[model samples]
Each structure stands twice: as structure tokens, then as C-alpha cells.
Target: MNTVPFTSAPIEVTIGIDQYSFNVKENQPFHGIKDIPIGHVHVIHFQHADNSSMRYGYWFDCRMGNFYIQYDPKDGLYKMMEERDGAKFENIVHNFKERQMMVSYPKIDEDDTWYNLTEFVQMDKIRKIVRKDENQFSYVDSSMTTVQENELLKAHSLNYTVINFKSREAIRPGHEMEDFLDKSYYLNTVMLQGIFKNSSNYFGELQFAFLNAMFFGNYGSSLQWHAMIELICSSATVPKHMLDKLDEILYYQIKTLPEQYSDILLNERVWNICLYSSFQKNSLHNTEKIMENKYPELLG
Candidate 1:
């Protein structure tokens, strides 16, 4: 149930009509009724175990709702999937659970049904998730104390010049993917890795964290060669410049993107969780230039 308070997080997760020990009415929409069942609805209730009711959760219709998996600040990614059926889903979800934002879909098939997945983020998740075993993923060894963060900052640091380039283009959303490119904060979304931990295994955890963001997020498209590459380069140990010429090539592609790629960039379903973080009415005055991006720089 979405009733989880804003400050809550997930400690366990499960799947079934009684997902949260409730007959969750999670449904999809058909025509004017925003209630169509994918045969499965997410039900997460913290109270089932008592002490809390809003810490973490499994959302209904992963294809549509926003859900942040449970991660006990004290327990790391908690193991809550109990039913035999949810075992595969549990592994996939826990594998990349650290990423704070999840954009997933009911893929119909990713080893099975009602499964959702993503590209640089999605592709990475797929590559790692598809050809792997349960519990193959590793979680935090220990939460990082301030001491670890300070040490890492001193030992591994960079002189990053963050560039938050604003676009003159105005992004707006429509009803479906037929044609939609959220000009909002939709681009560079792949660079959006979530949850920074100070664990001793910082880098490795971070890699997974980034994977969580992309693989789970609804914002990116691994198909866009340039943008997809940007997601990859920004995540690993590679220096920012390892992505040399990436932005230019991407900008060029935007200006002259082939019909195939252009579609992915501007595509959005009105109900798709991949909506632009910020949007205006299609009538809002257009301000940004898609190809006017002068440089690309995300950080060290």
C-alpha cells in the first residue's frame, strides 16, 4: 500500500494478492477506468511486522507507480520475499536495490512474468541480472561512517566542474509514446545514480547503486548510443574524460538523430512512469534547443 509515510522505507517485500497482507486493489487502466489488473498488484505494509508502516515497500503495477524498495538503514537491503514464486523477482529487485529511484515495467518475460527492467542502467541490470543466480548479488558490508567517507575523499578524488546546462527547449508531456520527449530534467537522467553510501566497499557499492538507478529508473533509454554510453562512463572508475567526444557526438546525433533513435528520445506514454520530472503544457513557450548542448560533463 502506498500509505507508507513519506519518511518510511522498506524492510521486506513479497508478492501476491495479499502482498502486504492486504487484498491490494492494484490495477492498471483501460479506457477511462484507471483500474486494470496485471493479474498482480503490489502490497507492502510495514505494520505486518509492527513498529513501522512506511519504511519501504513494493508498489502496485511496477509499470506505472513509483516505488522505493526497502533498505533497512540498519539492515541494508532486507530479504522480505517469502513466497516461492517471488524468489526470482526478489533477486532482481535486491540486486540493484540501493538505487533510490526505480523506473520499471512488467516485461512479460525476463525469466518470467510481471517483471520490469531498464539500458545503460537497464542493460547493465539485464546483463548482470539475466545471466546470474539468486543471491549472486552482494549488499552493503557495513554502513559507512563519516570516517570512511573522509578517507575516500582524500584518497580518491577529482577536480570536477559540474555543469548543469539549462536547455532553452521547453519539454511537455502528451498522452502516449506516439511522440513525447520530456524536455524537463529527462535528459542526463542516466547520470542520476541514487543513494550515496559511505561503506568501505564504496566504489563497488556505488557501481551497484548506479545500476539500481538506471536499471530501475523509468527515465532512460539504453538504446541511445551516446546517452547510453554516457551512463556507463559516468558510473565506473573511468575518468570523466574517458567519455571524450561523447557529448559532441551526442549533440550531433540529436540534431540529426535517425528516425529510430529520435523516437526513443522523445517517446513517453502519458501514464508511463518515465514521465519528465518537470514538464509544462505543450503550449508553454518553447525555450530549449535539443542540439544546442555545448558540452557534457557529469563528474569524477
Candidate 2:
């Protein structure tokens, strides 16, 4: 288990006439793309016409009973494979030449599942992959002072609770919950301590501190993203003025975003963490909620 063989070149697969590439060793276990006992998980780097790459993950087993595609049900592009009679059940395949891909749901109910690859690729089902080995985070580094180091290092044991993004419960680290977000723990810890240290610089540092936590957080696992938001909100790091600035920035962003992307960006589940947390008196208060009602940025 320690020494998995490395492949010299990328594994290439064909979908009709077009070719796509992925690597089996590039497994992303953090976002739930993991190997099952009898199956393997792989990450597919699907290229778009705009020259951007979107990541899609799939798991397939030897028995063909465990194939899954990570997708959002809201789009209606993916349908569950129902148990009804006359349902077509077969191995999934993508044929870009024919502009259709055949798929069947093993766990969810069977309904006829086929979609155009061109449209399916644009359905916002892009899943960010985090490998097991990458661990560098961009935050405080060599510019730190001895006092800053001591302050931040001492914060390692601080009793801050990471509210579970899904369950909304306070979870203890160094336990089962740690596995969900270990990759982010160190970076969030440093950021939290950094916020605590420079709390005096309300606008210059503290304001952007909150923004950076939310922005940089997009790179971490989803659980880690929520955990970082909870920590920033609960830590008393942001004041009313900063929260107001956040509101202006967000409102301006919503207004400035092209009409197409703004809708998707507003409805994301993760935004709720910061939005709800802003209600606390000691934290970001009412600004996020204000944006919701005042500008009508998000739907109810």
C-alpha cells in the first residue's frame, strides 16, 4: 500500500472520436473521490472550448455495480436510474461525436439518463480535486516576528470549535472530524492567529483578513471552507465597519458580475456560512443579511 507504481504518461481515453486524458494515481480522496475495495477512482480533466480545464471524478468497479458520477441534482442534467421495467442499464460511455453520453444510476432510481456532452460540461458540476500530498498554503510566512510566532504557535491549542458545514454542530479536532479538514487546519490556524494578532488594523488588515479567509478558502476542501468561515466569524475578528465594507464589496461584486455567473455565484451553499454568521453581535452583524434584503442578491 505504501508504494503504488507510478505511470510514466497520462492515461488517455477516447470518447467517440475525441480523446480525453486523466491519471489514475491522481486520486482525490479529500472531496470523496476515493478507491473502494473492488474499484478504482479517477479524476478526469475535461477541457473546455475556452481553454479552461474542469475536473470530473468517477468511480468504477470490476462488477460494474458501482459506477458513480459526482453531480448536482439541481441542474436536472443527471437523472437517477430507477428500478422500473424496460429501463436501459449499461456501462456509461461518452461519445462526443454523437453529442450524447449514456449513463445509469446504480444507487438512485433508474430513469433514462443521457445528455449532450457539450451542455453537460457546462452544468456547474465541476468538482475541485485535492490530492493527498499537496500541503503548501499561502499565508503568513518568513515576515513574521518572534512575538507573532509565539502568539500564533500558542494558538495551536486554542479551544476554537469548527462548526461542521453540513451538520452545523461544533466538532472537536484531532478526532474523526480532523480527517475531513486536516489539510486546512494548519492554514486556518495561522490565519486565525494572524487575525487575532493584528486585530488593531481594522480596515487595512482586519477587513481584508475576513475577505481573504473567504476567498482563499475556496481552494480548500468544502468542509474546510465552511470550517474556516465559521472560525473567522466566531473569532470576533471582524467588526461592524469591516462587515459593512464586506457588504459593499459583495454588492458591488454582484452588480459587476456578468448576469450569467452572478446567479450561480449567489446561490452557492457555502455563502450561507458567512451570511448566517454575520448576525452575531460580536461578529459581522447584519451586513450579509442586509445584502440579501436590500439588494435582493440571493433568493429565499
Candidate 3:
């Protein structure tokens, strides 16, 4: 599948607060950083089922600082979802598209205050006013008014029901593994064979590959260290002598910095090492550059 470039048009909004007025840019990429001030904010608004009117606004705030107001022109919602949190937002948008509705919620930060401007609107002939609360603060479909508690429950149920089926099919033999092997056991055997055949290459790859894979997971680049440790412990092809040496290194490393590996185990380290090794070649140049540029001060 072709990867889509994640881009969006800047949204400008005027905010008047106690006579000191300023223009706040909305619909900026939600990166949880100051550079992109406006994160995901929930705003209760009316949506249309018929797709007649095209624009909506929501309120969001992170208790750390100021409140922000966000506006969406429907055209950019899908991109917003993908850019913010890939899998989570992607799944939410997929469900909304399937159901033919606009899903919106206020973005709240670590603290629970409503940070942005919160309001309600009537669109698509659906008139509803929703109040902000910890639960049921955001509305999805336009068919209901007054943000009924049951509606949120129903929406979640429908979304999860679809997700469960998709997850099941994903693990089914012919579905995802068909290209790998004719049978599930055959696929597993091939995977093991490939790992054994490429054990050395795997170790070499994890020496750098762990960085790129870290981007997809919550742990970030630092996760690579743990990933490397995991790979060294597993892999049937890896020499038993090497595995023993790895265990020794791990024990000393953990003892020297017990905080880092307190929750991890020898077997887990091997697993991460193998998984990250596969991506090593693809990530080497970038990882090297990062190490070089980011640690220039230390080198000096």
C-alpha cells in the first residue's frame, strides 16, 4: 500500500480573552508538544447525517497551560486522526466512515480542566447540546440529541464489535499467513527456519534497527536498548556460548543500572533482540546520524 503524506491546511481562529485578544491556530498537528499548541480537544457539536454542511469546532485544554479552541473543516479530519495517534485514531476514523458520521471530542491534557472554548452546534438537521463530562464528553453520530449516555455506549459497542472481528480475521491462518505458508504450522516452521538461518544477521541488525521500530511503539527510541537485550537471549541459531555470554553481560548491566531492567527478564530480552534485528539494515544510517548529531556536545 502507498503511504500517504500527512499534511493539513492551517486553521486560524480569533480568541478574545478579557480584552487581550489573540489569534490561535487550530487543526495544527497534535504532537503533544508546544510547537503544535493545539492537541486533541473535545467540543460537543451537532453533526449532519446527510453530509450537507461541512465544518465543526471543538474545545480542548491541557491543564499544564492555556486553553485552546480547535476547528475542523471535515475535509481534514481523517488526516488529523492518522497524524495524531496512528492506530488509535485510524481505527476510530475507520468506524466513523463506515457508519457515515462525524466523530468529535475535546482534547484534555494531564489535568481535567476544560482548556479550550467549548460550545454546541446544530448540523445536518440534528439539534443537540452536549455538556462536557469525564465520560460521554464527545459525540459521534448526528442522529441523537442531548448526548444520551446510551448513545456513547452503543457507539463503543459497535466499534469494538467490528474491531473484534477484524482482529480475529487478522490472526486466522488463510487471512494474514496465507502468503507466508500453506498452513499455520508451516508458517511457524518457516519463521523459525528463517530466524535460525539469519541469526547472525539478526544480531547485527538489532545493533541499530531498534531505533526505527521504536517510533511505532510508545516507548520511543530508548526502547531499542531493551529490544537489543531481548534478542540476545533467544534465537535457536545463536550459539549457546554467545547466549551464555549475553546472560553474563545482562546480569552485570542490570546490576550496574538495576533501574533500567528491573521489570525485564532474560527471555524477554532475547525476543526484543530478534524482533528489532530484522529492521537493523533499514535503520542504520538514520540511527548513526541521530547518535552523531545528538551527542556532539558529549563528544566535545
Question: What lDDT score goes with residue 83 in model 3?
Answer: 35
Candidate 1: deviation at residue 260, Å?
A: 30
Per-model C-alpha lDDT, please?
0.26, 0.28, 0.28
Q: Which window of ten consecutive residues has the lowest lDDT sum in model 2?
A: 1-10
Stronger candidate by TM-score (1 vs 3): 1
Which lDDT tens digits does candidate 3 get at residues 49-109?
A: 3333332222222222332222356643322122333576445434433223221222334
In candidate 3 the C-alpha lDDT for residue 287 amounts to 29
The superposed Cα distance between candidate 3 and the true structure at residue 102, in angstroms, equals 30
How many times do residue backbones clash in model 1? 24
Any idea what lDDT model 1 has? 0.26
Whichever of 1 and 2 has more TM-score, that candidate is 2
Segments of candidate 3 deviating more than 4 angstroms = 1-7, 11-213, 216-228, 233-300
Residue-wise C-alpha lDDT for candidate 1, range 207-228, written one tens digit per residue? 2232222222211221222233
TM-score of each: 0.21, 0.27, 0.20
